[model samples]
Target chain A: ITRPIIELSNTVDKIAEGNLEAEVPHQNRADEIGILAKSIERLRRSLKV
Target chain B: MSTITRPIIELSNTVDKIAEGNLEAEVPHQNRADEIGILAKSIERLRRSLKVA
Candidate 1:
């Protein structure tokens, strides 16, 4: 639950730090956290381009 | 009103402000090491990116 949010947040921090290769885990979550993970992934993709 | 959930909620509120085009909005939980701190850092970076773009 909340754990996934923490993980996603950490990954997002890495991505924000220009670590585009930093992989987001727990994306298989079936909840809002999953949506957030997907959003971060999208941002990673957008930034890479 | 527990300690953990309170700041998380506060972070979410500030995030709402950021979402509404308030890139200058500041998150108040950066001192934390859990999700909130990381979220705050990421949002700060995002705001900077928005400013640069």
Candidate 2:
């Protein structure tokens, strides 16, 4: 329900659906969102599907 | 440090599921020590090591 959470959830939704072009909007200053963005990209490599 | 990891929330949930006590969450890992993996380890350790309640 938190904004950071919404941001993360939305971002993941985009990435999980093969939208590698997704970039998280910069409404959060907590760096976790940024990390999430990076994490998704890294997770992509680990994916063979 | 490319993206592919979830944040501490996963670990928090894991902790909450097993630990009946609500304590302050600590980042035990500091200075960008690949924090996500550290968080995973933290949760694993909470279930495996440091049996303090």
Candidate 3:
């Protein structure tokens, strides 16, 4: 992963590949990362539940 | 509630159900190439892969 942004992209990649249990980092981040995490988690719950 | 994030969340929720068996789900906004688009495309791209296997 490139460092900040690319890593989050990897998180999506994990979930995208059916790893619904993948943890989205930066839940507490107050920036764009947090925004992406929020969305990823939404995706996760849908697959999980 | 960001303009960027909300769509992703909505897209996520929408795609979640689609993950199981159908790629026909709306999968909107994947047209965008930004982070949000990647996530939205995440569902589409993955399903397209799984659609084969």
Candidate 4:
């Protein structure tokens, strides 16, 4: 079973497939990775909506 | 009342309803000369006929 980053991973992969530049910047906090991933995912998805 | 430019947001929700098959949806046009009012009316008329299919 995948934990938190699974959704972010899928979203990032989808964006990457489109040749769009995207990256997660975790600011040293253990949870930062997931947070960064979510932020990036949201920012990218908003372009369409 | 004279035409005034309101934020596009007030119109977005109604437009969404029209988009989602509410062909008979009508927006209360106070003056019908606001910047997007004509666009809104055109959308309503088109939506009514388009949803027939």
Candidate number achieving the greatest TM-score relative to the actual structure: 1
lDDT tens digits, residues A7-49, model 1? 7677766765668888878557665555556566666676677
- Displacement of residue B40 (Cα, Å) in model 4 is 1.8
Angstrom error at residue B20, model 1: 14
Instruction: Name the better of 2 and 4 by TM-score.
Output: 4
Interface RMSD of each: 4.4, 12.1, 4.3, 15.9
lDDT digits (tens) for residues A1-49 of candidate 3: 1254456667767876778787878767776556556756766676677
Pairwise TM-score winner, candidates 1 and 2: 1
Off by over 4 Å in 4: A1-49, B1-7
* Per-residue lDDT of A34 in model 2: 49
lDDT tens digits by residue: candidate 4, B1-53:
12322323334444455545565766544245543444345434444544554
**Candidate 3 has which clashing residue pairs, if any?**
none
In candidate 4, list every pair of residues with a backbone clash.
Answer: none
Kindly indicate the candidate among 2 and 3 with the higher TM-score.
3
Order of candidates by DockQ, top first? 3, 1, 2, 4
Better candidate number, 1 or 4, judged by lDDT: 1
Give the winner by DockQ: 3
- The global C-alpha lDDT for each of the candidates, from Candidate 1 onward, is 0.64, 0.43, 0.64, 0.43
The alpha-carbon lDDT assigned to residue B20 of candidate 4 equals: 55
Model 4 C-alpha RMSD vs. true structure (Å) is 15.5
User: In model 4, what lDDT does residue A39 have?
Assistant: 47
Sorted by lDDT (best first), the order is 1, 3, 2, 4
